[PDB]
């Protein structure tokens, strides 16, 4: 997933990865906080830099970040 976020050129793949990560975050059946953090940091670094023009992908990622900051469990983490 990290290599898809970093190197994969297809924006549909990035949208699918962001959907997978959003479903994981909004839910042992889910990844640990460290894996979510790694994926979110990679997305934060590469999605905006590699796809500035994709407004829908950036909107989806920013909606996920917004949910994370609104969430009480992850607040202060």
């Amino acid at each position: 997933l990290t290599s898809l976020i970093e190197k994969s050129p297809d924006a549909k793949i990035l949208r699918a990865v962001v959907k997978i990560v959003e479903e994981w975050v909004k839910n042992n059946q889910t990844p640990t906080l460290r894996e979510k953090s790694i994926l979110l940091v990679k997305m934060m670094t590469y999605i905006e830099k590699r796809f500035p023009e994709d407004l829908e992908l950036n909107a989806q990622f920013l909606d996920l970040v917004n949910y994370v900051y609104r969430d009480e469990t992850l607040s202060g983490s």
């Binding site: 900051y69 607040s75 202060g76 983490s77």
Partner: protein, 154 residues
């Protein structure tokens, strides 16, 4: 003053003179308001070594880069403060910097201390140098020459 909580809070080729080290330490302490170990007190007040380099270079004997200032602070002043730089500055009594300027003045003083045939061409032209023509006659000659040139052209 306590800063409000945010959503992101986790709940050298020339030798350095004592005046340069003192300026470096005082810049870091007074301006950045950082502690000895540069631990961040307020998230917005991140260390700015460009400002410190500007402060040091106001009295330095040579241009000190921001990287050089950071390296000097971390590698000398932190271990020295952990005689202190203030004590060395007070004991020097500006002697070293005065002797530096004396040496520069001596080098500048050393540098400061280390610091006929003319008638032939007239006769070829036809000019009697010893019998000046008044400007009226020379103007008349010019007019005659111009008239002859115009006649030749026509």
């Amino acid at each position: 003053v306590v800063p409000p909580r945010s959503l992101f809070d986790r709940a050298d080729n020339p030798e350095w003179l004592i005046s340069e080290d003192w300026a470096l330490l005082q810049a870091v302490k007074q301006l950045l308001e950082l502690p000895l170990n540069l631990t961040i007190v307020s998230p917005a007040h991140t260390p700015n070594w460009d400002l410190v380099s500007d402060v040091v270079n106001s009295c330095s004997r040579i241009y000190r880069s921001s990287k050089q200032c950071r390296n000097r602070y971390e590698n000398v002043i932190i271990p020295r403060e952990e005689l202190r730089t203030s004590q060395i500055y007070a004991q020097d009594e500006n002697a070293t910097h005065t002797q530096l300027y004396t040496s520069h003045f001596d080098l500048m003083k050393m540098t400061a201390g280390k610091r006929p045939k003319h008638a032939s061409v007239l006769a070829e032209s036809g000019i009697n140098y010893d019998k000046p023509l008044p400007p009226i006659q020379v103007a008349s000659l010019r007019a005659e020459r111009i008239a002859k040139e115009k006649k030749a052209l026509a």
